[PDB]
Amino acid sequence: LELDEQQRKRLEAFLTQKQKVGELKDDDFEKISELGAGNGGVVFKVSHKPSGLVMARKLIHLEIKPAIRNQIIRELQVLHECNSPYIVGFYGAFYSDGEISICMEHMDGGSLDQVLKKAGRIPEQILGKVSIAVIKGLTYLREKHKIMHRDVKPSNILVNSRGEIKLCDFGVSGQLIDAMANAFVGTRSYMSPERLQGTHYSVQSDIWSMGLSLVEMAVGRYPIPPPDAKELELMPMAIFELLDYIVNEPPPKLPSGVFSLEFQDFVNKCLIKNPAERADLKQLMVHAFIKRSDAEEVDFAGWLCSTIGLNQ
Amino acid sequence: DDWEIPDGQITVGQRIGSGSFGTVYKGKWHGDVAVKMLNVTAPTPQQLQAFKNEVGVLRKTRHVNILLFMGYSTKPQLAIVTQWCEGSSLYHHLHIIETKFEMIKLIDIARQTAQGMDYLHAKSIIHRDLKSNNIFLHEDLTVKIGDFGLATVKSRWSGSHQFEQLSGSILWMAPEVIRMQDKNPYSFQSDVYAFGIVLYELMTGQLPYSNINNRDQIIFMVGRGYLSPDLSKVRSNCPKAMKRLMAECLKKKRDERPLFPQILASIELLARSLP
Numbered sequence: 001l002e003l004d005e006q007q008r009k010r011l012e013a014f015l016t017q018k019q020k021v022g023e024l025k026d027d028d029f030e031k032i033s034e035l036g037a038g039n040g041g042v043v044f045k046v047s048h049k050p051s052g053l054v055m056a057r058k059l060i061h062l063e064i065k066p067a068i069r070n071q072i073i074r075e076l077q078v079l080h081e082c083n084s085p086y087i088v089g090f091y092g093a094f095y096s097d098g099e100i101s102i103c104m105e106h107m108d109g110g111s112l113d114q115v116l117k118k119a120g121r122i123p124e125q126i127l128g129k130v131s132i133a134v135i136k137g138l139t140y141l142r143e144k145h146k147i148m149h150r151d152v153k154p155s156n157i158l159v160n161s162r163g164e165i166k167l168c169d170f171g172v173s174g175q176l177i178d179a180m181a182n183a184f185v186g187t188r189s190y191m192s193p194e195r196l197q198g199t200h201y202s203v204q205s206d207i208w209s210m211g212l213s214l215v216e217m218a219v220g221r222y223p224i225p226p227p228d229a230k231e232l233e234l235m236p237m238a239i240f241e242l243l244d245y246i247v248n249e250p251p252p253k254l255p256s257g258v259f260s261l262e263f264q265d266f267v268n269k270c271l272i273k274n275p276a277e278r279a280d281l282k283q284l285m286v287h288a289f290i291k292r293s294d295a296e297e298v299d300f301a302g303w304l305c306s307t308i309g310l311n312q
Numbered sequence: 313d314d315w316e317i318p319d320g321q322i323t324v325g326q327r328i329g330s331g332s333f334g335t336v337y338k339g340k341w342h343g344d345v346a347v348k349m350l351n352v353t354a355p356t357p358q359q360l361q362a363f364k365n366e367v368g369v370l371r372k373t374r375h376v377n378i379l380l381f382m383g384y385s386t387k388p389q390l391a392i393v394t395q396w397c398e399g400s401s402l403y404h405h406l407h408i409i410e411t412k413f414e415m416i417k418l419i420d421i422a423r424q425t426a427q428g429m430d431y432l433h434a435k436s437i438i439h440r441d442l443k444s445n446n447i448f449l450h451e452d453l454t455v456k457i458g459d460f461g462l463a464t465v466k467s468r469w470s471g472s473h474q475f476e477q478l479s480g481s482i483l484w485m486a487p488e489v490i491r492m493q494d495k496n497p498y499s500f501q502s503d504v505y506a507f508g509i510v511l512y513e514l515m516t517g518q519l520p521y522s523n524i525n526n527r528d529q530i531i532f533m534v535g536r537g538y539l540s541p542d543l544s545k546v547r548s549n550c551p552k553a554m555k556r557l558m559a560e561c562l563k564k565k566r567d568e569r570p571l572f573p574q575i576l577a578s579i580e581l582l583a584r585s586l587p
């Protein structure tokens with residue numbers, strides 16, 4: 001990997017924390033608080049009494065064959081090998097009382113979905129650091145594990161007071177993906193237009209999903225369909241029509257003048273409807289916006305703590 | 313009020329689980345009941361009145377293949393009280409437990425489901441959410457359909473005009489239901505399409521679109537007409553007439569699907585000629 005001294009220190013520390021954690025049991029967890037819920041799971045701040053550690057415990061209730069559940073639990077153990085400063089830490093996964101538990105590092109900042117709601121809009125200079133972290137995490141996944149994230153969106157980008165930005169809820173388990181897809185219905189979608197239509201063009205799909213998110217976080221509103229005229233000056237569509245619009249209408253784009261030109265070009269390169277013309281990780285990592293944002297000195301940690309109301 | 317249940321008369325018990333439009337608990341109300349805490353806690357006045365009218369229609373329904381609808385409470389929060397059903401749902405049997413039914417029994421399940429749907433349609437009731445999750449095998453013999461109707465609480469309102477939104481699973485939704493483009497998408501024929509998906513479950517042991525692992529892909533392609541259940545997954549012991557009836561109920565175009573008297577007659581007819 002390519003870590004500076006702080007990142008390498010923090011990951012070594014994480015693994016040594018994981019050492020105190022043995023076989024994970026339902027009885028060894030004390031519930032502290034609720035963190036959030038989504039289409040399939042509910043997440044809790046919990047205390048692992050044996051080690052004293054504090055974790056985020058996702059619970060998924062799937063009505064599925066025991067063999068499928070066991071295969072999911074088996075495939076999920078690969079998350080032990082997925083160590084990066086841009087990937088949420090994994091402590092363990094197990095089954096109990098009809099529900100699958102995924103135990104993760106607690107990120108005190110939450111997801112960028114929550115942070116967006118508390119911020120209204122996220123400034124371009126912050127979204128640059130976010131873009132760097134997301135690109136680098138997707139890259140780690142593809143180059144160390146041949147994994148594409150498969151669900152890039154604000155809800156699955158986590159942040160914390162120590163400044164870190166990490167990816168979460170990515171498709172490490174195919175059986176889990178298949179099980180989730182046979183159930184609940186969303187109200188918006190971050191799926192690429194080629195994925196909605198069939199075969200997915202490697203990580204390019206993820207990249208579109210990132211760009212869309214970057215637009216949502218920049219204007220403070222999910223950008224399908226784009227603001228007609230009146231909504232834009234301030235500075236519900238059914239799911240099928242949203243998918244139809246994503247596939248058949250032009251891609252969303254940032255409003256001009258209010259955002260820098262490099263960032264506009266960045267998100268437009270990320271939102272090309274043809275997946276081959278669409279920019280890949282190689283190309284985005286050296287894009288004008290990314291060189292500039294990599295240079296800029298931004299206190300992401302302080303911005304986040306101010307936005308949520310925390311202290312340092 | 314009429315068929316209203318007062319505040320503290322129901323023993324609310326163990327949590328069973330959550331679905332498209334509520335959370336089910338086991339309870340007591342002159343016997344065991346299912347108490348569904350609806351996902352519409354605070355309802356608008358017009359909505360609550362339409363809900364009362366719908367409950368009045370549902371309370372009149374009685375059939376051997378229909379779970380009894382018993383009433384509703386309004387406090388501590390809005391709920392539904394229905395017949396509790398020992399034994400697992402058709403989904404649990406086919407897709408979790410993997411119960412090995414013989415074709416005679418599979419056809420009998422289809423026939424009883426069609427009986428219940430025929431009755432519901434004769435009383436002019438659109439089920440809206442037919443699926444194997446809402447089909448129970450009581451004593452393993454009788455088929456019981458639940459969670460029918462209740463349109464006024466499957467969506468949420470802003471005044472007298474009601475919003476309209478997709479809920480739960482997409483596998484049983486007809487293309488016109490997926491799209492929401494047509495003025496009123498829900499019809500007898502949407503229930504017929506859902507019944508065709510149930511027939512697919514019975515005759516393949518599988519949910520449709522088993523190879524596809526993208527939810528939104530299914531929504532888009534099924535709504536556009538690009539994707540239909542792969543009927544070649546149907547087992548060898550499945551009668552040809554049942555396959556053709558399945559394909560008839562699954563037509564992309566709403567008007568082409570048969571109604572449930574004809575479906576029931578076909579199922580009975582073919583139940584005769586059997587090994």
Ligand SMILES: CNS(=O)(=O)Nc1nccc(Cc2c(C)c3ccc(Oc4ncccc4F)cc3oc2=O)c1F
Pocket residue numbers: 058079087088089090091102103104149150151167168169170171172173174176177178180181525526527528
């Ligand atoms: C609509 N179609 S889709 O293809 O977009 N859907 C899907 N997308 C993406 C993934 C999946 C499945 C999945 C899920 C849900 C999952 C959740 C949590 C998890 O824990 C950790 N996460 C990150 C770091 C450390 C962890 F401990 C691992 C997971 O691994 C998984 O495989 C999908 F179903």
Ligand SMILES: Nc1ncnc2c1ncn2[C@@H]1O[C@H](COP(=O)(O)OP(=O)(O)NP(=O)(O)O)[C@@H](O)[C@H]1O
Pocket residue numbers: 035036037038039040041042043056058088104105106107108110111113114155156158168169
């Ligand atoms: N490790 C974590 N630390 C802190 N908060 C978390 C963590 N994991 C998840 N959350 C929170 O839990 C909420 C719900 O989790 P989740 O089940 O992934 O739903 P979601 O990702 O937000 N949307 P969806 O993917 O459609 O279900 C998220 O919005 C996060 O704010």
Ligand SMILES: Nc1ncnc2c1ncn2[C@@H]1O[C@H](COP(=O)(O)OP(=O)(O)NP(=O)(O)O)[C@@H](O)[C@H]1O
Pocket residue numbers: 328329330331332333334335336346379394395396397398401441445446458459480
């Ligand atoms: N009358 C009942 N008796 C016993 N269990 C029931 C009854 N109704 C529902 N359940 C169970 O309660 C749980 C949740 O049901 P429910 O909320 O209705 O979701 P669902 O049936 O899977 N889909 P939907 O009915 O469309 O919302 C499932 O395990 C059902 O099998």
Ligand SMILES: [Mg+2]
Pocket residue numbers: 155156168169
């Ligand atoms: Mg998430």
Ligand SMILES: [Mg+2]
Pocket residue numbers: 331445446458459
């Ligand atoms: Mg039900």
